[PDB]
């Protein structure tokens, strides 16, 4: 599909933004396993520091999945703008 | 009241600034003097180009004539009017429509008569005053049928309400054309005045004085000019507008009057007019009554710009420039005809 | 005039009903059933305070805002033939914001006095809190309305200034004196609002 | 009684904001468009 | 008991609804047919 | 040495300002307000930095600051392709012409965002957060507080004997996740905006002295600059000193009924000096408060009426509409004195817009991307994909474009009205030399 | 003791005085400024004489300030209500009376400027009329000052 | 022995009397000044005579001051209520009646001043009608004075 | 056993009787004066015999004065309420009835004087018509006098 | 211990902040679109520039969104009333402020679009005047934010 | 234990959201359709593009349908009142905001569609502005969704 | 509501019919719709008043 | 346990549903019919 090279280029930029930002998010949690403290915690939070390490690892996993989707999107958009 | 000075500039703020900015460009007494000190039409152009006027004779015939200066000046103010008329909203546009109506009235008088004496619309339209326009059809391609023009007017032409006095076509054929146009003008002035009084704020107080003057002006001048013609005194009275100072009492005396002195005797009861008849020396080499009326009318149109929150500034705007056009052409005519001693017959516009 | 007719009909019916109800309570010799003290005491001072604060800020910007477009339209229109106008006549708008600023400062200073009561039964509770509540309400209203009308004045005057300057550049400076009075009127409201809340306490 | 503290206070705030709504709507309704365009 | 509640509700509910009808009736009453096309000739 | 216009060839010349590929854009936004007086101090050399700085304060967002630069870089990278092409799109041309302005604006926005430690509402952890020692919190008679914590927050006390120490650089990241950031950080930015605004005004006034020297108008400083700067210093500089004093003089030990600089400032102007009931910042403050306000009044006669008074004195001795000159000077005095008060409020835009932006960033993050996260692995990852894509879209649509444009305009407003009006006065004519402009034709 | 809410009316008085006087001054000022600007385009030589109406408006604004300040300084918590009612009356008396005066100031100044624009000899007469409006503002102030001291 | 808030009615009387009278005089003054400014341009020599309607208006303002002060002096805390109703009636009676009179003063002066310029013989008729307006204002004053002492 | 507020109803009657009557007479006076001024331009000899509508307007004002004074003198503290309602009815009856007449007086006077200018024969007719308005005003007085003594 | 209805005032704040801001921005948008459509016919090259008033109005709409969301995320059941009135004030404060802002935006933009097309030198002034209105709207936002911590 | 009649507010929300949104879309639809009928007679080739205002108006109506249904499906008998206050806020927030957007749609549609026939380059400009009105409507939906589940 | 419809349609329809005799049938049909709108009211009233 | 007056609201609903929709349909019918009459005189073929 062509879709227009102007829109393929926009997708490439968004895809690069997605991969860069999402991987960074996972790293920050992986290193500080943190101020943000937004891993989607449970309300019934117990006295278990290991729960913060575990959820932070979950955030990294989920973030890298999102980046993987941006890698696929960027790849497709790359070929569109190059061929257009 | 507290009615004006509040919502006025919400929609009409731009036009008020623009129209006064345009007024700022009208020829001053100093500028008229520079136009007088020419004695040549080419120099007249060059001196006029010193103001907002000018650059309108460019690309025209190398010889400069009065007909070109006249037409071009009219065109300038028509364009400026249409601009402001188009960039306007019903609250103000309806007021402006009345101004255009005065010209439409004259134009429809032209459409009839010619229709009555087999003339085609296409031949008549080129001689109609601008702003009449008549973009509507049915008034166009009437097939030189008076009935078709009469019906098209009743239906499409905004002046249909005014023609309620002159109806059934029978009136068109049996009435003198000038009685028809004076009758229609009365209907216009009466409706327009009432409209101004419905806008019962600053506009009513700023606008009506001018309309009331015009109404009384018509009574005075019509009475005098009617002396030498064939017209029943009652039919003459029928043409006197009721929006003025003569209506309560005074028109009855003008209707009976058969002499200039009797008309002046009426003015004697109205100092604002008495002074005009006294100023109108009417000597063989002096100003006349019509000239004093123009001077008074302009004074009023200038005073109109003492109110910053009304519609009357636009009415005065058009009328003031119309006189300015008369003034400029007068100078061109004085040059063209070489009568320098008659140059000072323009009406100063301050 | 469809809207004006609606507004009038509501206005007349609103007060006409109040007259009938008021006089009826008197006629039927009710035991002061409509008790103003009751309304004033049950009505939480918190509403009165927060209302006055919102009024102080909200009314003041309305004034400024009103005047701004009054003078904006005149400047923009006239400026077509006199573009010089924007150089000097923008000060009219500065005066309009300045009227908003007067109210804005007071709105913040007043709101800085807002405190909780931890109060329940008004009986012998919050005697001072009612005074401070009503005072804050008044002071907010005082400055709000005063700035509201000032902003309208300044707009009207600034419009004339723009129209005048377009035709005579020498008139600008002299006219400025009128707008200064307009600003002073708003400052007078500020002085009173300051006094009204000069000795208040919340909580 | 006819009114409670709650009801009355609610009505007071309701009317204030109703007046604001009315003011805004008033000027919004009294808004016109152009009859014609100036030129081509 | 709870008079103030039914009272408050019914008064303001019926008042707002009644006005909506009154305004709607006004707007319908004064419908502008255009006063043109054939009206000028019948007038 | 200040930059001034070039000489042109006893009539008022046009103003000629030499510009280059980078500084031309800055001169234009100056010229947009007006053409400066011949031999006037050119504000543009100071705008080059001052304006980006004011933006960076208004747009203090580390993450968007980067994106903003990248946008400018894109345009610069195509500089050769954009110049040697047709550009009928004027909005593209304008932002292109301002591409070097935008880049700089981003550069400072990063600087200020870094100190604020906000990158899309993200803090910058330098391992220096030592504000409090949580281990000691529990020791201070807080045993199993996390059980009750399920329904409470609990604010960390000051000066418990175990807390203290500043964050190495910028605001301690811990405030980025606090529920009361809205008082700690909002207050700081409030005070910062006031301090910066006053300094900027004083700078603009100081420049007026150089202009007064260049045109050899000793009177413009004898009754102008001097009494004007005295007015401003005594009232506005004093306030700034008090703000720093408060920060350095009082600790939490006096947090209850701690002196309020707002109330003391108001009481200063009103000469209200209660004997007791309110703690003063320092002993004798009442005497200083009275002194400064009286002096501020004493300088006014010079600025208010003595200029036309001495001009009348000197005029009649050498031999001037005295009444008209009094009108001019009186209006000028009011504008300066009242404007300083109003201008100070103008610079509250730095706080207002910095806060407004911070509110957009915090809310846009919290109500868009945060909700996209979930404890379920695959659903969370895929959700973040779609939610983030929309999030990035909103960040651009709302903050990078619209708010960046707003902050541009508001900082430009401050330059034109509050800064320039202290020294950059009068008008000049457009400098239009013969040039070979018709190169393409 | 001193009942609650008693200060309410005195606060409304102090507020009313200032607001209504501001209304009066604002109307008279805006109307006068309009007329002055319109004249000065036609002839600037009358501008200085035409300024007084604007000050006249400001006087109404001060009138209101004098009472509003007098009350605002008098306002306390322990008000015996009687004093609050006196304050309410004084506030309304000066404010609403100044409003009427300011209206007259506006109308007369605006018409006066147009009158002088055509004939400068009207100046003295127009000022004398505005003097009556100032007297109307004074009467309001007088009554308000009397009431506040009862 | 007396009820609370009984003084409320009295202070409303003193205020109302002054406010309505100022509104009446202000209206008549505003209309008169407009007519004077418009007329005097054509007939400047009449400027010193056309002021009279404005004085007539000032009389309405005095009417109000007299009663408002008379009531104010009679305002106490221990008011018997009965007396307060009389004071309120007196205040409204003179104020509202003066308001009506001021309206007529305005309209009659406006028309009369211009009519006089166009008709010098109208001067006497104009004054006579203005005398009737003053009589209408007095009737209110008479009743108010009767009530305030009843 | 006398109901409180009984005096309120009463005093409101006396005031209303005066206020509404002045409103009517003032309206009729304002309209009559306007027509008279315009008429005087053409027919100055009629100015003096054109004042009658204004004198008649004053009759309406007196109608009101008489009742208001009769009530005011009748007002006491220990009023049995019954009398208070009669006083309110009497006040409204004469005041509002005279008010309506005042408009008739004004409108007919204006039209009559303007017409008389052209048709001097209209004068007897103008007066007869205005006589009917005077009769309408008296009817209100008659009922008010009956009620105030009942 | 929580006064009932305490949550009612709070919820209204969030709603008003959004509704009134939308009204203002919509008004400004409607006014601008009218001027833009009329102007753009003759000078289509100015279509892009003419959008600015609309973007500014859109900012007003955001201003409102920020408060409405901030309040909404701050609502609970056990609201202590004190907090509720702060939220209501915040909503109303930004609402009316944004509403007035939007009106100034719309009115000025309409004139500005026409003025700029006729005189491009007015472009900067158009932005400036709209800029001041946007600054006024910001104040409305900030005060709504300030109350959230009081 | 739950307050009675608590469902009233939530029910009014569901209905209010739908009605106000229909009012908004109806205005924009009627105003745009008028411009379409007036325009497309001259430029029939634009008949399939001038519908856009109307389509975008339908969006306002859907925004209301989504919330009105969301609210209705959220109502029960034993409502804790708190939830009902939220439901009314959400209903009004989207409804009245959609109403404001509907006005923008209508006015911009009319001006844009007729302008487009005069200048086809306006077509994109019209959409962009209408896009801003749609964004204004969206903000209302966002807040309503936030409140309705809060 | 039906009365409004009848009146407005009757006025325009009857006058139009003289100008266009072919309008008669269309006028009747439209008036029939207004009568149906009036009947809907009757139908609801009959069902409701008997419930 | 049933609140008295409770049925009042439901009855007003049944009425409002018909009254308001009737007002709308009546407006639309009358407004369209007027335009139709104007059309038919110009050309009945579209009636």
PDB file of C-alpha atoms in Angstrom, chain B residues 35-195:
ATOM      1  CA  UNK B  35      -7.964  72.079  -6.271  1.00  0.00           C
ATOM      2  CA  UNK B  36      -9.205  75.574  -7.074  1.00  0.00           C
ATOM      3  CA  UNK B  37      -5.653  76.813  -7.672  1.00  0.00           C
ATOM      4  CA  UNK B  38      -5.338  74.755 -10.852  1.00  0.00           C
ATOM      5  CA  UNK B  39      -7.215  76.155 -13.879  1.00  0.00           C
ATOM      6  CA  UNK B  40      -6.226  72.950 -15.671  1.00  0.00           C
ATOM      7  CA  UNK B  41      -7.813  69.512 -15.529  1.00  0.00           C
ATOM      8  CA  UNK B  42      -4.464  67.738 -15.647  1.00  0.00           C
ATOM      9  CA  UNK B  43      -3.215  69.841 -12.749  1.00  0.00           C
ATOM     10  CA  UNK B  44      -6.520  69.155 -11.005  1.00  0.00           C
ATOM     11  CA  UNK B  45      -5.780  65.440 -11.185  1.00  0.00           C
ATOM     12  CA  UNK B  46      -2.230  65.916  -9.921  1.00  0.00           C
ATOM     13  CA  UNK B  47      -3.380  68.019  -6.974  1.00  0.00           C
ATOM     14  CA  UNK B  48      -6.228  65.644  -6.146  1.00  0.00           C
ATOM     15  CA  UNK B  49      -3.769  62.739  -6.066  1.00  0.00           C
ATOM     16  CA  UNK B  50      -2.374  64.383  -2.932  1.00  0.00           C
ATOM     17  CA  UNK B  51      -5.225  62.835  -0.957  1.00  0.00           C
ATOM     18  CA  UNK B  52      -7.062  59.528  -0.756  1.00  0.00           C
ATOM     19  CA  UNK B  53      -8.606  60.562  -4.040  1.00  0.00           C
ATOM     20  CA  UNK B  54      -6.630  59.941  -7.189  1.00  0.00           C
ATOM     21  CA  UNK B  55      -5.110  57.260  -9.400  1.00  0.00           C
ATOM     22  CA  UNK B  56      -8.595  56.594 -10.815  1.00  0.00           C
ATOM     23  CA  UNK B  57      -8.037  58.507 -14.042  1.00  0.00           C
ATOM     24  CA  UNK B  58      -5.057  56.315 -14.886  1.00  0.00           C
ATOM     25  CA  UNK B  59      -5.266  54.256 -18.078  1.00  0.00           C
ATOM     26  CA  UNK B  60      -8.166  56.425 -19.270  1.00  0.00           C
ATOM     27  CA  UNK B  61      -8.252  58.594 -22.383  1.00  0.00           C
ATOM     28  CA  UNK B  62      -5.380  61.056 -22.578  1.00  0.00           C
ATOM     29  CA  UNK B  63      -7.867  63.972 -22.748  1.00  0.00           C
ATOM     30  CA  UNK B  64      -9.361  64.678 -19.324  1.00  0.00           C
ATOM     31  CA  UNK B  65     -13.084  65.367 -19.287  1.00  0.00           C
ATOM     32  CA  UNK B  66     -15.734  66.153 -16.732  1.00  0.00           C
ATOM     33  CA  UNK B  67     -17.752  63.044 -17.562  1.00  0.00           C
ATOM     34  CA  UNK B  68     -14.783  60.887 -16.559  1.00  0.00           C
ATOM     35  CA  UNK B  69     -14.168  62.756 -13.321  1.00  0.00           C
ATOM     36  CA  UNK B  70     -17.880  62.556 -12.498  1.00  0.00           C
ATOM     37  CA  UNK B  71     -18.270  58.848 -13.193  1.00  0.00           C
ATOM     38  CA  UNK B  72     -15.027  57.900 -11.468  1.00  0.00           C
ATOM     39  CA  UNK B  73     -15.855  59.735  -8.249  1.00  0.00           C
ATOM     40  CA  UNK B  74     -19.271  58.105  -8.050  1.00  0.00           C
ATOM     41  CA  UNK B  75     -17.693  54.723  -8.631  1.00  0.00           C
ATOM     42  CA  UNK B  76     -15.187  55.231  -5.830  1.00  0.00           C
ATOM     43  CA  UNK B  77     -17.807  55.826  -3.146  1.00  0.00           C
ATOM     44  CA  UNK B  78     -20.078  53.092  -4.484  1.00  0.00           C
ATOM     45  CA  UNK B  79     -17.289  50.553  -4.134  1.00  0.00           C
ATOM     46  CA  UNK B  80     -16.490  51.703  -0.614  1.00  0.00           C
ATOM     47  CA  UNK B  81     -20.176  51.565   0.289  1.00  0.00           C
ATOM     48  CA  UNK B  82     -20.660  48.105  -1.188  1.00  0.00           C
ATOM     49  CA  UNK B  83     -17.628  46.905   0.759  1.00  0.00           C
ATOM     50  CA  UNK B  84     -19.098  48.070   4.060  1.00  0.00           C
ATOM     51  CA  UNK B  85     -22.570  46.930   3.038  1.00  0.00           C
ATOM     52  CA  UNK B  86     -21.304  43.452   2.262  1.00  0.00           C
ATOM     53  CA  UNK B  87     -19.297  43.142   5.493  1.00  0.00           C
ATOM     54  CA  UNK B  88     -22.381  43.805   7.624  1.00  0.00           C
ATOM     55  CA  UNK B  89     -25.043  42.023   9.646  1.00  0.00           C
ATOM     56  CA  UNK B  90     -28.813  42.428   9.564  1.00  0.00           C
ATOM     57  CA  UNK B  91     -28.931  44.737  12.629  1.00  0.00           C
ATOM     58  CA  UNK B  92     -26.986  47.302  10.608  1.00  0.00           C
ATOM     59  CA  UNK B  93     -27.505  46.064   7.053  1.00  0.00           C
ATOM     60  CA  UNK B  94     -31.218  46.863   7.156  1.00  0.00           C
ATOM     61  CA  UNK B  95     -30.341  50.486   7.881  1.00  0.00           C
ATOM     62  CA  UNK B  96     -28.005  50.523   4.900  1.00  0.00           C
ATOM     63  CA  UNK B  97     -30.687  48.999   2.688  1.00  0.00           C
ATOM     64  CA  UNK B  98     -32.810  52.105   3.236  1.00  0.00           C
ATOM     65  CA  UNK B  99     -29.943  54.194   1.900  1.00  0.00           C
ATOM     66  CA  UNK B 100     -29.825  52.028  -1.200  1.00  0.00           C
ATOM     67  CA  UNK B 101     -33.621  52.188  -1.435  1.00  0.00           C
ATOM     68  CA  UNK B 102     -33.455  55.913  -2.141  1.00  0.00           C
ATOM     69  CA  UNK B 103     -31.470  55.108  -5.279  1.00  0.00           C
ATOM     70  CA  UNK B 104     -33.575  52.063  -6.165  1.00  0.00           C
ATOM     71  CA  UNK B 105     -36.639  54.315  -6.154  1.00  0.00           C
ATOM     72  CA  UNK B 106     -35.152  56.526  -8.833  1.00  0.00           C
ATOM     73  CA  UNK B 107     -34.074  53.471 -10.815  1.00  0.00           C
ATOM     74  CA  UNK B 108     -37.501  51.826 -10.813  1.00  0.00           C
ATOM     75  CA  UNK B 109     -38.947  55.124 -12.021  1.00  0.00           C
ATOM     76  CA  UNK B 110     -36.539  54.650 -14.951  1.00  0.00           C
ATOM     77  CA  UNK B 111     -37.621  51.003 -15.383  1.00  0.00           C
ATOM     78  CA  UNK B 112     -41.237  52.196 -15.725  1.00  0.00           C
ATOM     79  CA  UNK B 113     -41.793  54.999 -18.279  1.00  0.00           C
ATOM     80  CA  UNK B 114     -39.308  53.148 -20.464  1.00  0.00           C
ATOM     81  CA  UNK B 115     -41.371  49.988 -20.072  1.00  0.00           C
ATOM     82  CA  UNK B 116     -44.513  52.106 -20.713  1.00  0.00           C
ATOM     83  CA  UNK B 117     -42.884  53.535 -23.882  1.00  0.00           C
ATOM     84  CA  UNK B 118     -41.592  50.164 -25.240  1.00  0.00           C
ATOM     85  CA  UNK B 119     -38.003  50.223 -24.032  1.00  0.00           C
ATOM     86  CA  UNK B 120     -36.188  46.990 -23.176  1.00  0.00           C
ATOM     87  CA  UNK B 121     -34.732  46.445 -19.714  1.00  0.00           C
ATOM     88  CA  UNK B 122     -31.276  45.788 -21.140  1.00  0.00           C
ATOM     89  CA  UNK B 123     -31.347  49.282 -22.631  1.00  0.00           C
ATOM     90  CA  UNK B 124     -32.449  50.865 -19.349  1.00  0.00           C
ATOM     91  CA  UNK B 125     -30.142  49.086 -16.900  1.00  0.00           C
ATOM     92  CA  UNK B 126     -26.959  50.838 -18.121  1.00  0.00           C
ATOM     93  CA  UNK B 127     -28.427  54.155 -17.047  1.00  0.00           C
ATOM     94  CA  UNK B 128     -29.492  53.018 -13.581  1.00  0.00           C
ATOM     95  CA  UNK B 129     -27.716  54.422 -10.570  1.00  0.00           C
ATOM     96  CA  UNK B 130     -25.385  51.981  -8.842  1.00  0.00           C
ATOM     97  CA  UNK B 131     -26.597  50.224  -5.717  1.00  0.00           C
ATOM     98  CA  UNK B 132     -29.950  49.737  -7.400  1.00  0.00           C
ATOM     99  CA  UNK B 133     -28.363  46.696  -9.012  1.00  0.00           C
ATOM    100  CA  UNK B 134     -31.549  44.568  -9.212  1.00  0.00           C
ATOM    101  CA  UNK B 135     -29.766  41.214  -9.302  1.00  0.00           C
ATOM    102  CA  UNK B 136     -33.201  39.576  -9.187  1.00  0.00           C
ATOM    103  CA  UNK B 137     -34.798  38.410 -12.412  1.00  0.00           C
ATOM    104  CA  UNK B 138     -38.453  38.701 -13.489  1.00  0.00           C
ATOM    105  CA  UNK B 139     -37.802  42.434 -13.306  1.00  0.00           C
ATOM    106  CA  UNK B 140     -35.405  41.437 -16.080  1.00  0.00           C
ATOM    107  CA  UNK B 141     -36.783  40.210 -19.400  1.00  0.00           C
ATOM    108  CA  UNK B 142     -40.194  41.693 -18.621  1.00  0.00           C
ATOM    109  CA  UNK B 143     -40.858  41.602 -22.398  1.00  0.00           C
ATOM    110  CA  UNK B 144     -41.699  45.331 -22.272  1.00  0.00           C
ATOM    111  CA  UNK B 145     -44.863  44.326 -20.423  1.00  0.00           C
ATOM    112  CA  UNK B 146     -45.777  46.815 -17.676  1.00  0.00           C
ATOM    113  CA  UNK B 147     -47.763  44.109 -15.894  1.00  0.00           C
ATOM    114  CA  UNK B 148     -44.712  41.856 -15.716  1.00  0.00           C
ATOM    115  CA  UNK B 149     -42.547  44.621 -14.284  1.00  0.00           C
ATOM    116  CA  UNK B 150     -45.300  45.541 -11.798  1.00  0.00           C
ATOM    117  CA  UNK B 151     -45.639  41.907 -10.623  1.00  0.00           C
ATOM    118  CA  UNK B 152     -41.892  41.334 -10.455  1.00  0.00           C
ATOM    119  CA  UNK B 153     -41.582  44.449  -8.293  1.00  0.00           C
ATOM    120  CA  UNK B 154     -44.352  43.365  -5.950  1.00  0.00           C
ATOM    121  CA  UNK B 155     -42.675  39.980  -5.529  1.00  0.00           C
ATOM    122  CA  UNK B 156     -38.875  40.181  -5.800  1.00  0.00           C
ATOM    123  CA  UNK B 157     -38.003  43.842  -5.349  1.00  0.00           C
ATOM    124  CA  UNK B 158     -37.642  44.939  -1.702  1.00  0.00           C
ATOM    125  CA  UNK B 159     -39.449  48.185  -2.555  1.00  0.00           C
ATOM    126  CA  UNK B 160     -42.736  46.304  -2.972  1.00  0.00           C
ATOM    127  CA  UNK B 161     -44.004  47.610   0.376  1.00  0.00           C
ATOM    128  CA  UNK B 162     -43.511  51.202  -0.780  1.00  0.00           C
ATOM    129  CA  UNK B 163     -45.546  50.627  -3.963  1.00  0.00           C
ATOM    130  CA  UNK B 164     -48.667  49.932  -1.807  1.00  0.00           C
ATOM    131  CA  UNK B 165     -49.558  53.632  -2.416  1.00  0.00           C
ATOM    132  CA  UNK B 166     -49.163  53.288  -6.218  1.00  0.00           C
ATOM    133  CA  UNK B 167     -50.890  50.052  -7.202  1.00  0.00           C
ATOM    134  CA  UNK B 168     -53.038  48.105  -9.657  1.00  0.00           C
ATOM    135  CA  UNK B 169     -50.996  49.367 -12.597  1.00  0.00           C
ATOM    136  CA  UNK B 170     -53.884  51.772 -13.260  1.00  0.00           C
ATOM    137  CA  UNK B 171     -51.959  54.107 -10.987  1.00  0.00           C
ATOM    138  CA  UNK B 172     -48.842  53.650 -13.094  1.00  0.00           C
ATOM    139  CA  UNK B 173     -50.553  54.745 -16.301  1.00  0.00           C
ATOM    140  CA  UNK B 174     -52.814  57.486 -14.930  1.00  0.00           C
ATOM    141  CA  UNK B 175     -50.431  59.124 -12.413  1.00  0.00           C
ATOM    142  CA  UNK B 176     -47.816  61.660 -13.637  1.00  0.00           C
ATOM    143  CA  UNK B 177     -44.412  59.901 -13.421  1.00  0.00           C
ATOM    144  CA  UNK B 178     -43.078  62.601 -11.072  1.00  0.00           C
ATOM    145  CA  UNK B 179     -46.088  62.229  -8.722  1.00  0.00           C
ATOM    146  CA  UNK B 180     -45.397  58.487  -8.616  1.00  0.00           C
ATOM    147  CA  UNK B 181     -41.729  59.042  -7.676  1.00  0.00           C
ATOM    148  CA  UNK B 182     -42.537  61.729  -5.134  1.00  0.00           C
ATOM    149  CA  UNK B 183     -45.240  59.463  -3.651  1.00  0.00           C
ATOM    150  CA  UNK B 184     -42.858  56.515  -3.406  1.00  0.00           C
ATOM    151  CA  UNK B 185     -40.205  58.704  -1.810  1.00  0.00           C
ATOM    152  CA  UNK B 186     -42.691  59.802   0.832  1.00  0.00           C
ATOM    153  CA  UNK B 187     -43.447  56.172   1.623  1.00  0.00           C
ATOM    154  CA  UNK B 188     -39.720  55.472   1.837  1.00  0.00           C
ATOM    155  CA  UNK B 189     -38.991  58.414   4.107  1.00  0.00           C
ATOM    156  CA  UNK B 190     -41.912  57.606   6.373  1.00  0.00           C
ATOM    157  CA  UNK B 191     -40.869  53.978   6.751  1.00  0.00           C
ATOM    158  CA  UNK B 192     -37.177  54.807   7.142  1.00  0.00           C
ATOM    159  CA  UNK B 193     -37.919  57.400   9.806  1.00  0.00           C
ATOM    160  CA  UNK B 194     -40.067  54.934  11.735  1.00  0.00           C
ATOM    161  CA  UNK B 195     -37.285  52.382  11.420  1.00  0.00           C
TER     162      UNK B 195
END
